[PDB]
Design a protein around this ligand. Structure first.
Ligand SMILES: *[C@@H]1O[C@H](CO)[C@@H](O[C@@H]2O[C@H](CO)[C@@H](O[C@@H]3O[C@H](CO)[C@@H](O[C@H]4O[C@H](CO)[C@@H](O)[C@H](O)[C@@H]4O)[C@H](O)[C@@H]3O)[C@H](O)[C@H]2NC(C)=O)[C@H](O)[C@H]1NC(C)=O
Ligand SMILES: *[C@@H]1O[C@H](CO)[C@@H](O[C@@H]2O[C@H](CO)[C@@H](O[C@@H]3O[C@H](CO)[C@@H](O[C@H]4O[C@H](CO)[C@@H](O)[C@H](O)[C@@H]4O)[C@H](O)[C@@H]3O)[C@H](O)[C@H]2NC(C)=O)[C@H](O)[C@H]1NC(C)=O
Ligand SMILES: *[C@@H]1O[C@H](CO)[C@@H](O[C@@H]2O[C@H](CO)[C@@H](O[C@@H]3O[C@H](CO)[C@@H](O)[C@H](O)[C@@H]3O)[C@H](O)[C@H]2NC(C)=O)[C@H](O)[C@H]1NC(C)=O
Ligand SMILES: *[C@@H]1O[C@H](CO)[C@@H](O[C@@H]2O[C@H](CO)[C@@H](O)[C@H](O)[C@H]2NC(C)=O)[C@H](O)[C@H]1NC(C)=O
Ligand SMILES: *[C@@H]1O[C@H](CO)[C@@H](O[C@@H]2O[C@H](CO)[C@@H](O)[C@H](O)[C@H]2NC(C)=O)[C@H](O)[C@H]1NC(C)=O
Ligand SMILES: *[C@@H]1O[C@H](CO)[C@@H](O)[C@H](O)[C@H]1NC(C)=O
Ligand SMILES: [Fe+3]
Ligand SMILES: [Fe+3]
Lengths: 348, 348
């Protein structure tokens, strides 16, 4: 057991995994399934060793006995002195992004509006918002709070899989991988911009990245900041600029996970794989780059500087937080999750 | 589905039930209907899980398959050597309460007088008084025996909904919930106290708690118990102290009801929810008090110390008792209820 078996979600992520694998020298190899939940099943079964996961999926991974290995990190505003791999992890800002166009659409007016979702179970997309809606209404009927929505991974027939478009042909509509046109940070934000939904549930960084021609993608070229406002909890409406005083909650950074045994191994292999193929990687852009996927945030986020280390070797709880673990657990009192049911039965 | 969905009757029972979610972390959640019957419907459909019911509605919900789960229990009139939750439930005193000023008024002369009732189909407001009024005049014209009434739950465009005042702008008159000024125990007394009625059919407890400024409520502040008399079945009057000797019947205490498939889950969550927020609450009144209402008697009665366990999985017949059931049966021979007909076949 020297090779590291990486699970890729969907085919777009599989192509990038191939390259990584060829170029690594079989040092890192590929497994693939259609969803993140599926891939977390591969790691359990041991048809794979590791993948990078949104907090959301980490809770799940975490309940199923998997542990975090490295956390993504990105451009800070402090000590350039400290090495990226030792630079402390910041944690991203989950926001509800609307258009200034949409008059009188505050947080409290979201009732029966249209919504764009990264995916079900994800932090910014789903846990932070649906957490705060579900609690406030003291109702588990989140499935009925928005008139219509795009949350891939939700029931394809249901009204959360209304606005979801699919791929090139409109096949495999509302599947939680990149094949879905409105999937992920980017796909949800395209959704708000193309005016399919009144609000998007993505992160601060997503907005900037896809506004003011900071994006080669056709749909994001023209877009400008002032045509997008942030809903604050208290009820106010503020510009994307003021995300510090107008954000729903603080997200823990997309970590990598594995089984316990394979953690230390996976740690070493990755620290070396990123030294080779990272942003400041000898063989980047010489042969292949791991943190570049064509604004498709494949395997890792594109805004990822490196993968920093985890102080005190922490539990899924310790990493995510006691606050956000409480939030998820409550929201999850409202749903049945087969994966999370099975793991409970077979990690008692 | 860990969450327990409380069914809350009307928008004052909603505000308290909503909070209960927030301080229980969605361990408990809200559904709402206008009326108690509509709520019994939501528990049937499974759109909610449970609510607390006067024995009256427990007959209704029973006929429709719901089972009882936990009785209400108040401060004992014996030695509380046992824990409240194990202390036997004592019953409560259903009584005719007249003003003293109105001499010449007795039980024997109630005919053609105005009447106030908790609500239609309840135990103190209806099932005992009207069940006896029909008992003695050998006539099923309870719709006629009083000149007018307030009896929220009756036909809005009838005489039993004549005296009912509704809310603030007096809308939704006679709607059987706390938004109707003379709804329930409280309202039946406030009815008799604002002399819109010659009699009010409430329970012994109701008088002491609203007389001699044992209530901060403006109408109940300057009310004195010596301006009130209890009609017995001999034909005599008597003062609020002779209740044990001058009462119509002994009502079985308010219980929680749910589907048979959710009972043990509902109970577990409650027993512990009452431990956190009950009378001896870890968080009562730190965070939220389950047996204390901003208005009055919301979700539960405020005289509730704890919710007691029952005997061995009792049916609606067992918990109400073969007596109070045959008396209800005989009063319902004279008038049909939609929810009782629609369910008639489940018991037959
Ligand atoms: C919302 O998301 C955005 C990210 O997607 C955030 O905007 C970015 O802010 C970062 C802050 O780190 C910007 O990084 C810049 O990159 C330079 C690297 O060369 C930095 O260093 C320079 O400045 C000083 C010199 O004065 C020295 O440190 C050094 O010598 C160097 O020259 C810059 O200082 C700067 O940080 C990044 O460009 C921004 N991205 C975009 C697209 O504008 C934004 O903060 C997020 N908002 C919140 C509230 O979190
Ligand atoms: C009719 O209506 C009234 C309800 O509104 C009833 O009046 C209440 O009755 C009780 C007494 O039966 C009153 O409280 C009592 O106060 C005692 C101390 O002052 C309590 O403590 C004692 O009991 C136990 C003993 O084991 C211990 O806890 C303790 O050591 C102590 O000895 C009593 O337990 C008891 O609560 C109550 O204040 C009255 N309420 C009001 C608002 O006045 C009345 O009984 C009803 N009558 C009938 C027949 O139904
Ligand atoms: C909401 O409901 C849950 C019950 O579903 C409550 O917390 C859970 O229940 C008990 C507390 O009564 C906890 O168990 C206790 O912890 C120790 C240590 O493991 C255990 O050995 C004992 O059996 C003990 O009873 C349990 O840990 C806890 N479960 C989880 C997953 O946290 C909770 O109190 C309720 N919250 C509210 C706000 O009502
Ligand atoms: C990972 O792949 C690399 C080659 O791509 C291997 O790295 C070499 O390891 C040896 C001995 O362990 C070192 O002395 C060399 O410095 C490395 N070679 C180069 C060119 O850097 C490594 O063996 C592989 N590891 C695993 C676990 O598969
Ligand atoms: C569920 O939401 C409610 C508010 O809708 C949260 O409770 C409020 O938080 C404030 C903050 O100090 C507290 O003072 C009050 O208890 C609540 N507000 C009001 C108006 O009562 C509650 O904390 C939320 N639950 C979680 C897990 O965050
Ligand atoms: C009414 O009287 C009949 C007997 O004539 C009896 O079966 C029933 O229990 C009585 N109901 C009440 C409320 O007294
Ligand atoms: Fe995320
Ligand atoms: Fe009652």
């Amino acid at each position: 057991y020297t090779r590291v078996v990486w699970c890729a979600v969907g085919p777009e992520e599989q192509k990038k995994c191939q390259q990584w694998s060829q170029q690594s020298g079989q040092n890192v190899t590929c497994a693939t399934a259609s969803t993140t939940d599926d891939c977390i099943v591969l790691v359990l079964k041991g048809e794979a060793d590791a993948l990078n996961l949104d907090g959301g999926y980490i809770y799940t991974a975490g309940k199923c006995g998997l542990v975090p290995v490295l956390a993504e990190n990105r451009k800070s505003s402090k000590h350039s002195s400290l090495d990226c791999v030792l630079r402390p992890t910041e944690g991203y800002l989950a926001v509800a992004v609307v258009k200034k166009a949409n008059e009188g659409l505050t947080w409290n007016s979201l009732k029966d509006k249209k919504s764009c979702h990264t995916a079900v179970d994800r932090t910014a997309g789903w846990n932070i918002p649906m957490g705060l809606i579900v609690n406030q209404t003291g109702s588990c009927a989140f499935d009925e709070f928005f008139s219509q929505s795009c949350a891939p991974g939700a029931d394809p027939k249901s009204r959360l899989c209304a606005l979801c478009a699919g791929d090139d042909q409109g096949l495999d509509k509302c599947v939680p991988n990149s094949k879905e046109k409105y999937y992920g940070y980017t796909g949800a934000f395209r959704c708000l911009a193309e005016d399919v939904g009144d609000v998007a549930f993505v992160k601060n960084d997503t907005v900037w990245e896809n506004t003011n021609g900071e994006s080669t993608a056709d749909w994001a070229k023209n877009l400008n900041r002032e045509d997008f406002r942030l809903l604050c909890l208290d009820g106010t409406r503020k510009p994307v600029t003021e995300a510090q005083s107008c954000h729903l909650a603080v997200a823990p950074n997309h970590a990598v996970v594995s089984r316990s045994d394979r953690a230390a191994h996976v740690k070493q292999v990755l620290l070396h794989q990123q030294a080779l193929f990272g942003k400041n990687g000898k063989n980047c852009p010489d042969k292949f780059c791991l943190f570049k996927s064509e604004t498709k945030n494949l395997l890792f986020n594109d805004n990822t500087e490196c993968l920093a280390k985890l102080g005190g070797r922490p539990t899924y709880e310790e990493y995510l937080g006691t606050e956000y673990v409480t939030a998820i657990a409550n929201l999850k009192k409202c749903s049945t999750s087969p994966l999370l049911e099975a793991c409970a039965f077979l990690t008692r």
